[PDB]
Nucleic acid binder design. Structure first.
Ligand SMILES: [Mg+2]
Lengths: 191, 195, 139, 56, 175, 50
RNA sequence: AGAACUGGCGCUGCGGGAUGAACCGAACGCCGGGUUAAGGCGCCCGAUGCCGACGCUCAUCAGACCCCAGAAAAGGUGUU
RNA sequence: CGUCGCUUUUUGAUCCUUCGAUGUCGGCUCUUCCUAUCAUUGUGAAGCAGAAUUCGCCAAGCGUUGGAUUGUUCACCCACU
């Protein structure tokens, strides 16, 4: 169809300032900084105006699978703004029958060493993506907490725990055992 | 004498068809840094049809038969070979004028290198379509010299910074040197007839 | 990043075709790759040129959306596009490029002699800037 | 509307070859004197004649 | 018909031969698009024979003149009605273009029917072409140019390969 | 057992749709199989409960 | 396997169909210049090295030109 | 109940090649190939609790035996796997 342009905007608050090197995005905020290159996606980025801080992503002509990716840009930027002011906190809980799953933290909140998964002697050490932090929760049974700035590194880390705890050669409609994600929240609350 | 074509950003058959025409016409062409030749279509597709080439093996003894080369200098050289009449002596003599080098050797690192805008990926591929590098599809098939080439590449280019650093120093001088003119009688004819 | 657009009133230069090298003012876009243009003061009249032919300049004109030939003509010479095109460095390059192609054989002699003359003066004087710079760093 | 006279003569050239030709249609070309390719002949246009040019 | 080159609108009239039964036949009129007027007065007998009991033997044409537009400079919206043939059946089709002339928009149709629907020019019958006014268009690709102060740039420009030297030392910027 | 943790386990193991052709394990509001081997077909049945 | 009508092959080279009895052009004394048919014009391989026009299409088995040398029913919120 | 294909490991139909000759069943011996997968690797689905099975997927890397009868291919039986 080759439409005349579309454009999403993203409002930015004051505590975070996006600068752009090009199609690369540099997001500095309160609890750190993180960056992504978007040099594969063929769009122009433009932050407009002082004191209001609006980002204007817009794609000239494009077709329908090229128009699908202008909303993909701004929703990766909105998770870089949320993750640098609030952070990401993926609480997860261990579900178990007869055998309690014993989960400890070996290297400073990076490695997770899971033992006694369903009575197995083979330990499971899962090394996480650099930027996340491991935690046995408090005032709650069998809960693990992951905290980080980047949503694609926390949620990938949250998936490596769940994928390692897979029940094999069994009926998986019973034997519902594993460490599954239970909540998708933030490090700082209510902003 | 000899033309030197830097091979990065180029497509495989779009470059090798032009090189094979020049080499029949008497010229001596040297294609340099053929690790970064591109090829259209995504990586897994180009990887499959090269593995389909590897099993093109004659059954009774594979020592005789198809010689599956793995360095991307010889991946390119074989593409040129199929665009030349190599079973004739006119095309045997053609393939001797072509010397293709992977990386950039020291006879050819201080020459000036040329590109072919017919075969460039930026020119010729539509920007929303996928392409594969000839370097890492050579790596996935038995070419064991990727790391020791890309170490020598960044040693070559750091020495290529320090030459271009002191060359733009010299032309900052001879443009500040021509600030003090004392020669404007000679600017008269060049500005009148394209300086 | 996309600092000049197509627009009603955008002055485009024409690179190739039957009107190669004359300005046009864009009047109306019609469909996706063809634009209705004319230059009334530069001898190219109203017709549909492709966008792939035309070269966008940084001159805009405030005339209505697809007016007549008169109203485009009044916008053209009030803003004085033909003289402001003389005082730009891109028309000095097309001026210089055609001065070099009609450069005759005797002028190619007169170019040659004064070209090697001013390169002797620079090479002997850029040597003197070398000769002083080593004298800065020797103490 | 003035409709002009439909024309009295026609110039006919033979544009196809000689071989692989039906016997009726190589009789009319024998009667039009068009034996090689690219021979021309001026032809009187009549009801009998236009019906020969429909065969050919 | 091959529709070679750009097409060309013709006004063709014609009437059947005056019999001893019927004198002064009604002299019908059509609107033929064809690359030249010999094809045009052949396409007249294709449609008239589909609608009346007339044929080239028992009729003649009495005018074949090129009719062409009263505004070659104004930009117009054309909505046209089609009767092409597909591989399975035949279809009715409405279709909107945007060009400076009637003959250039119907040429733009035959290029498009071959592009989109693979429909060859012998198999598609133009029913009627007329210029339509805006806010009565229904195709949103024609509709998106109805914008006063419309603007866009030209992204990623490519042309002039091998003409400007095959061998240069110069990576050509695409603006 | 812990019946709230019983629900959160079944959200990733039982509450899904199975295709009759590609046999993939999709999500409960799929209409088509995502796998190319079936041609993105639209005959789905729920994953059978115990 | 067996007829009808016409043209071919057999008895016939040549240009194109990579290859070939029969397809498509065209039929042949020995040459020089010109032009074409069928067919083509990235490079083998003469000719688009045209600033050709307009769209459609991404394939983890793409597609690619009469005869002719590989596919159907059914199906796809894949795109038009 | 229909109905659309594929394959050439069966049988036919055909009679193009071979009649101044292409050594004609089976077993033995040995090599390589195919997948339309029995087992093994990784998986998905069950009217999958476990165990045992079945239906699919990437898959031909690697295995797929010892005998009694019969010239037998085939067949059938014993035993291991
Ligand atoms: Mg014929």
């Amino acid at each position: 169809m080759k439409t005349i342009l579309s454009n999403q905007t993203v409002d930015i608050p004051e505590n975070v300032d996006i600068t752009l090197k090009g199609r690369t995005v540099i997001v500095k905020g309160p609890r750190g900084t993180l960056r992504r290159d978007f040099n594969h996606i063929n769009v122009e980025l433009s932050l407009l105006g002082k004191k209001k801080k609006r980002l204007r992503v817009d794609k000239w002509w494009g077709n329908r699978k090229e128009l699908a990716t202008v909303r993909t840009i701004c929703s990766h930027v909105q998770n870089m703004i949320k993750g640098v002011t609030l952070g990401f906190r993926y609480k997860m809980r261990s579900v178990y029958a007869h055998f309690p799953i014993n989960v400890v933290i070996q290297e400073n909140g990076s490695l997770v060493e899971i033992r006694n998964f369903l009575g197995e002697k083979y330990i499971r050490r899962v090394r996480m993506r650099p930027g996340v932090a491991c935690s046995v929760s408090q005032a709650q049974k069998d809960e693990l907490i992951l905290e980080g700035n980047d949503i694609e590194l926390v949620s990938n880390s949250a998936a490596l725990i769940q994928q390692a705890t897979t029940v094999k050669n069994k009926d998986i409609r019973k034997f519902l055992d594993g460490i599954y994600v239970s909540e998708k929240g933030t490090v700082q609350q209510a902003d | 004498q000899v033309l030197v074509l830097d091979g990065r950003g180029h497509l495989l058959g779009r470059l090798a068809a032009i090189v094979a025409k020049q080499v029949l016409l008497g010229r001596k062409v040297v294609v340099v840094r053929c690790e970064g030749i591109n090829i259209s279509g995504n990586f897994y597709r180009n990887k499959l049809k090269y593995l389909a080439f590897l099993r093109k093996r004659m059954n009774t003894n594979p020592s005789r038969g198809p010689y599956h080369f793995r360095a991307p200098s010889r991946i390119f050289w074989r593409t040129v070979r199929g665009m030349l009449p190599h079973k004739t002596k006119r095309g045997q003599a053609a393939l001797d004028r072509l010397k293709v080098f992977d990386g950039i050797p020291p006879p050819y690192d201080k020459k000036k290198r040329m590109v072919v805008p017919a075969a460039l990926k930026v020119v010729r591929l539509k920007p929303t379509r996928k392409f594969a590098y000839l370097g890492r599809l050579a790596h996935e098939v038995g070419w064991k010299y990727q790391a020791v080439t890309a170490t020598l590449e960044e040693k070559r280019k750091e020495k290529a910074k320090i030459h271009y650093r002191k060359k733009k120093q010299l032309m900052r001088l001879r443009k500040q040197a021509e600030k003090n003119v004392e020669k404007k009688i000679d600017k008269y004819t060049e500005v009148l007839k394209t300086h | 990043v996309f600092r000049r657009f197509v627009e009603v009133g955008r002055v485009a230069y024409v690179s190739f075709g039957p009107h190669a090298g004359k300005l046009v003012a864009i009047v109306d876009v019609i469909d996706q790759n063809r634009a209705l243009v004319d230059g009334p003061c530069t001898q190219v009249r109203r017709q549909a040129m492709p966008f792939k032919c035309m070269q966008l300049t940084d001159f805009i004109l405030k005339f209505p959306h697809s007016a007549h030939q008169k109203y485009v003509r009044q916008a053209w010479q009030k803003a004085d596009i033909n003289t402001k095109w003389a005082a730009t460095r891109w028309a000095k390059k097309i001026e210089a490029r055609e001065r070099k192609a009609k450069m005759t054989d005797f002028d190619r002699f007169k170019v040659m002699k004064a070209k090697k003359m001013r390169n002797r003066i620079i090479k002997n004087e850029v040597k003197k800037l070398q000769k002083a710079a080593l004298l800065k760093a020797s103490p | 509307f003035y409709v002009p006279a439909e024309p009295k003569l026609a110039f006919v050239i033979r544009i196809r070859g000689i071989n692989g030709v039906s016997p009726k249609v190589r009789k009319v070309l024998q009667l039009l004197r068009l034996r090689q390719i690219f021979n021309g002949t001026f032809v009187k246009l009549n009801k009998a004649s236009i019906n020969m040019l429909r065969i050919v | 018909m091959k529709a070679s080159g750009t097409l060309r609108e013709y006004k063709v009239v014609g009437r059947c031969l005056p019999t001893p039964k019927c004198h002064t036949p009604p002299l019908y009129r059509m609107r033929i698009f064809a690359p030249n007027h010999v094809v045009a007065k052949s396409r007249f007998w294709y449609f008239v024979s589909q609608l009346k009991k007339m044929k080239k033997s028992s009729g003649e044409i009495v005018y074949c003149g090129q009719v062409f537009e009263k505004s070659p400079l104004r930009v117009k919206n054309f909505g046209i009605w089609l009767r092409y043939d597909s591989r399975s059946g035949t279809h009715n089709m409405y279709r909107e273009y945007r060009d400076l002339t009637t003959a250039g928009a119907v040429t733009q149709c035959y290029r498009d029917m071959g592009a989109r629907h693979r429909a060859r020019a012998h198999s598609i019958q133009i029913m009627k072409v007329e210029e339509i006014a805006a806010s009565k268009c229904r195709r949103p690709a024609v509709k998106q140019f109805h914008d006063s102060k419309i603007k866009f740039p030209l992204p990623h420009r490519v042309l002039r390969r091998q003409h400007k030297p095959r061998f240069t030392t110069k990576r050509p910027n695409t603006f | 057992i812990e019946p709230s943790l019983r629900q959160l386990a079944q959200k990733y193991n039982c509450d899904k749709m199975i295709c009759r052709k590609c046999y993939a394990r999709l999500h409960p509001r799929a209409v088509n199989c995502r796998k190319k081997k079936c041609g993105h077909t639209n005959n789905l049945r729920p994953k059978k409960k115990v």
